[PDB]
Design a protein around this ligand. Structure first.
Ligand SMILES: Nc1ncnc2c1ncn2[C@@H]1O[C@H](CSCC[C@H](N)C(=O)O)[C@@H](O)[C@H]1O
Length: 257
């Protein structure tokens, strides 16, 4: 329902970050989902065979939480979003500008997950150096990155994006196919999204969401042309004032050879 143009005028990066990614004493349900996402991303990127040279994050928004473990496994990262103001928000953090969002408590939490073998600033410096380009993307487009000239990627990452960007299931499958064009044969697809979510709130701003159950997600990914290597259902809901999701999933898919 929510048109991509509504993002351009109505998506507020800072409101989004405070609601979802602040690690406060308030926003508990959001905090609990974030902890669970970070644990699953840690397992995916640090405990397995998900490694390579170039990772492309699709629909990054104004967030870097989804890259914190990934940068230990990929030395080159491209971040991308439909919304120019989300990109400025990432650029702020990338270049250590005043007004950049404070990721400190999330970085510390990831460093913990990873055995306190490094300090927060080392992790930040690594992630910053890894980010090779910040790009406009549109998942609905046959060439999602606008035909910017890139080598085939080793991994595509997409967190909490495709459900928001797709009005129905054929659109979802098409987005997955469009993304596939960026990925090398044998490459990895890593996705996180809400289950059975029809909306999410940013303050008073309501954004639509494609409500899918886990069986359907799995089928759609297989039908979009990938093989499923890992799949998890997360039993956590956002706040009643935030969303009507019934859990989330994380998955790892593979593009055929
Ligand atoms: N058609 C489209 N193509 C690419 N990104 C889109 C899109 N429509 C919406 N988006 C992006 O999808 C995001 C949903 S919020 C998810 C942000 C982030 N990856 C996280 O894990 O929290 C927004 O940043 C929005 O700009």
């Amino acid at each position: 329902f929510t048109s991509k143009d509504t993002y351009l005028s109505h998506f507020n990066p800072r409101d989004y970050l405070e609601k979802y990614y602040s690690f406060g004493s308030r926003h508990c349900a959001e905090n609990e989902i974030l902890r669970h996402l970070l644990k699953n991303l840690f397992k995916i990127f640090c405990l397995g065979a998900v490694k390579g040279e170039l990772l492309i994050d699709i629909g990054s928004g104004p967030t870097i939480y989804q890259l914190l473990s990934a940068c230990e496994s990929f030395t080159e990262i491209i971040v991308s979003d439909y919304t120019d103001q989300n990109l400025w928000e990432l650029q702020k953090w990338l270049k250590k500008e005043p007004g950049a969002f404070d990721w400190s408590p999330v970085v510390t939490y990831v460093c913990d997950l990873e055995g306190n073998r490094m300090k927060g600033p080392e992790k930040e410096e690594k992630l910053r150096r890894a980010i090779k380009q910040v790009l406009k993307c549109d998942v609905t487009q046959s060439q999602p990155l606008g035909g910017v000239s890139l080598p085939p990627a080793d991994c595509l990452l997409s967190t909490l994006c495709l459900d928001a960007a797709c009005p129905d299931l054929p659109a979802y499958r098409t987005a997955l196919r469009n993304l596939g064009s960026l990925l090398k044969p044998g490459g990895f697809l890593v996705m996180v999204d809400a289950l059975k979510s029809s909306y999410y709130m940013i303050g008073e701003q309501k954004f639509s969401s494609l409500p899918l159950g886990w069986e359907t997600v799995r089928d759609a990914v297989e039908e979009a042309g990938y093989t499923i290597e890992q799949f998890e259902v997360i039993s956590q809901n956002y706040s009643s004032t935030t969303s009507n999701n019934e859990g989330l999933f994380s998955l790892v898919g593979r593009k055929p050879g």
